[PDB]
């Protein structure tokens, strides 16, 4: 029996580049670094970057990782990353503010205002095609 997410691990071709992005641009804390990886923390999230040199990034699909942000900080976050030249991969069409951006290898990230409970609430009013609740 599982208790939740324990850690998220991303393959990275350029370790120094990825540490810089997550620590300096996104605000993660660098807890450890070694020749082949790094461990960072953000709130309770344990992130690990695992160096893998010929890594060519993910394939083109919907898999992505969303981080929380308070409503009051959204606009400034989005403005800051855009000013830094981060590339976006999706435009927001779903409940709560969301900014959809890529990391150095092309891993798909998201900064989202909202949670499961708020998404479910909005859904109960405006169902996606064929929605069942339970």
**Residue partners of 31: CB distance under 8 A and separation at least 6:** 39, 40, 41
Residue 110 designated active-site: yes
Give least dist CB 94 to a second copy, A: 11
Q: Which helix (H) or strand (E) holds 40?
A: strand 37-42
Q: CA 47, 53, 58: angle at the middle one, nearest 5?
A: 65
Q: Does residue 18 contact residue 105 with C-beta atoms inside 8 Å?
A: yes
Give least dist CB 11 to Tl ion, A: 8
Interface residue with Tl ion among 44, 54, 63, 91 (CB under 5 A) is: 44
Q: Does residue 107 contact residue 57 with C-beta atoms inside 8 Å?
A: yes
Contact status: 53 vs a second copy (CB under 8 A): no
Give least dist CB 50 to Tl ion, A: 4
Contact status: 102 vs Mn ion (CB under 5 A): no
Contact status: 31 vs a second copy (CB under 8 A): yes
Contact status: 123 vs Mn ion (CB under 5 A): no
Contact status: 34 vs a second copy (CB under 8 A): yes
Give the residue numbers marked as catalytic. 110
């Amino acid at each position: 029996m599982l208790t939740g997410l324990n850690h998220l691990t991303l393959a990275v071709a350029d370790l120094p580049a990825s540490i810089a992005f997550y620590r300096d641009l996104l605000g993660f804390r660098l807890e450890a670094r070694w020749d082949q990886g790094a461990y960072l923390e953000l709130g309770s999230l344990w992130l690990c970057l695992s160096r893998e040199p010929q890594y060519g990034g993910p394939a083109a699909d919907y898999t992505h990782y969303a981080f929380g942000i308070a409503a009051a900080d959204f606009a400034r976050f989005a403005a800051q990353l855009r000013a830094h030249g981060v590339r976006e991969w999706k435009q927001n069409r779903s409940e709560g503010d969301s900014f959809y951006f890529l990391d150095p290898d092309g891993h798909r990230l998201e900064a989202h205002v909202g949670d499961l409970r708020s998404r479910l609430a909005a859904c109960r009013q405006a169902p996606y095609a064929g929605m069942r609740f339970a």
